[PDB]
Design a protein around this ligand. Structure first.
Ligand SMILES: [Cl-]
Ligand SMILES: [Mg+2]
Ligand SMILES: [Mg+2]
Ligand SMILES: [Mg+2]
Length: 195
DNA sequence: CAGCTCTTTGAGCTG
């Protein structure tokens, strides 16, 4: 099996509060992209907040683009955008291959700087700890998990908490945007787990 | 149709 690190990015969801003074161009971009559900999806599109998703997807792609240059390969990932009770956030589960825990902090710090530069027009998001690596315990090492984390924690999310998900892991391709498939994989996970 | 372009990163689109 492969192993994964997790980075949680709190995605700006109120431009006036999080990106004070940002140019109108940012607003035009985020409000102008139209999203459509693939036919395999069984999600209710009306529950998806498009401007926030547009930002999350841009963050995701910039993140993975930079990550791959660090890892030197097309790293495996499962990313899920969620609308939490306090924050909209991206759960970025990325394979550890080619990235040591010792250097992970620095690499993530560089990606954060790139996000600020190429996504937020040089404006630092006014959200505390908006880019955080999941640790073993508060004040510990970087947490490493296996794919079992996906059906245990990510898959069971439903709308409106679940906003969208992406993955290059074949086992979870249908699950990304299909509730019925997520339910099937979670049920299988619980069955095996109870034993 | 071979590149140029865009909150890209590669493939749709145009000179
Ligand atoms: Cl939250
Ligand atoms: Mg290379
Ligand atoms: Mg969450
Ligand atoms: Mg493209």
């Amino acid at each position: 099996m492969a192993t994964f690190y997790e980075v949680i990015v709190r995605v700006p969801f109120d431009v006036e509060e999080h990106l004070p003074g940002i140019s109108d161009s940012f607003v035009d971009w985020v409000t102008g992209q139209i999203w459509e559900l693939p036919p395999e999806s069984d999600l209710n599109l009306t529950l998806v907040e498009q401007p926030q998703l547009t930002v999350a997807d841009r963050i995701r792609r910039v993140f993975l683009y930079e990550w791959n240059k660090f890892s030197k390969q097309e790293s495996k990932f499962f990313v899920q955008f969620e609308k939490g009770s306090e924050y909209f956030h991206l759960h970025t589960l990325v394979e550890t291959s080619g990235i040591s825990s010792m250097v992970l902090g620095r690499y993530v710090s560089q990606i954060r700087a790139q996000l600020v530069k190429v996504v937020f027009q040089g404006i630092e998001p006014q959200i505390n700890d908006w880019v955080a690596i999941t640790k073993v315990k508060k004040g510990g090492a970087n947490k490493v998990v296996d794919s079992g984390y996906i059906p245990a924690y990510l898959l069971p999310k439903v709308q409106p908490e679940l906003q969208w998900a992406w993955t290059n892991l074949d086992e979870y391709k249908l699950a990304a945007l299909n509730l019925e498939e997520r339910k099937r994989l979670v049920a299988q996970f619980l069955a095996e787990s109870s034993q």
